[PDB]
Amino acid sequence: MVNSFSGYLKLTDNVYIKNADIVEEAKKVKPTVVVNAANVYLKHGGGVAGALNKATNNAMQVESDDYIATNGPLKVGGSCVLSGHNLAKHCLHVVGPNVNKGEDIQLLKSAYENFNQHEVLLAPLLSAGIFGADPIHSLRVCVDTVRTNVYLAVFDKNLYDKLVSSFL
């Protein structure tokens, strides 16, 4: 079905990419699902998580603290669905491995598998940015793992251009 995502470059049958600030893109589109680059404690301090949480006026963090108090930490490679607040219907909090914590990059595939539970998502590249993985690798795993329709927002223009120009 037609959707309102605009200005994306089509990489494959199901994967699209744009140089965009995921906060602004979520505010404009109000997608059914926005993906957060979460950690196991849902402590949304920085990176994508800090930015999304700030845009919710800390409501995402308040909700997340209750989630953790009830359920305990997520697994690396795991996820949970919480409110999307003012950004989306739902936020899919997905934990990619953090290379700066020594976590196994193979868990990146498991992390992306969570996307297949949703027909359409707005998402960042998992484990990129402050999580320390190579974004080119993250994009490859995304394309080779996600079968549902995923609209990727890449914050940095230089990285966006490199991701497009190196894509196989």
Domains annotated on the chain, with CATH: 9-166 (3.40.220.10)
Burial (CB < 10 A; 0-12, 13-18, 19+), residue 84, is buried
Binning the chain into helix, strand and coil, the percentages to the nearest 5 are 40, 20, 40
Token pair belonging to 5: 């995502």
Dihedral in degrees, nearest 10, Cα atoms 68, 133, 28, 34: -40
Residue that is written with structure tokens 């219907």 in the block: 89
Residue that is written with structure tokens 């995402």 in the block: 60
Token pair belonging to 62: 């308040």
Give the phi and the psi of residue 82 in degrees, each rounded to 5. -130, -175
Q: Where do the DSSP E strands lie in the chain?
A: 9-10, 15-19, 33-37, 79-83, 90-94, 120-123, 149-154
Distance CA 114, CA 75 (A): 12
Token pair belonging to 93: 């909090």
What technique determined this structure?
A: X-ray
Edge-to-edge strand ranges of the sheet holding 9-10: 9-10, 15-19, 149-154, 120-123, 33-37, 90-94, 79-83
Sign of the alpha-carbon torsion through 7, 49, 65, 39: positive
Token pair belonging to 85: 């607040």
Token pair belonging to 132: 């320390």
CA angle 1, 165, 140 (to 5 degrees): 65
Token pair belonging to 97: 């491995």
Distance CA 87, CA 29 (A): 8
The data reach a resolution, in angstroms, of: 0.9
Nearest in space to 62 (alpha carbons), one of 86, 87, 43: 43
Token pair belonging to 10: 């089509």
CA angle 74, 151, 92 (to 5 degrees): 20
Strands 79-83 and 120-123: unpaired
Buried b or exposed e, range 114-144, using 16+ CB within 10 angstroms: bbeebebbbbbbbbbbebbbebeebbbbbbe
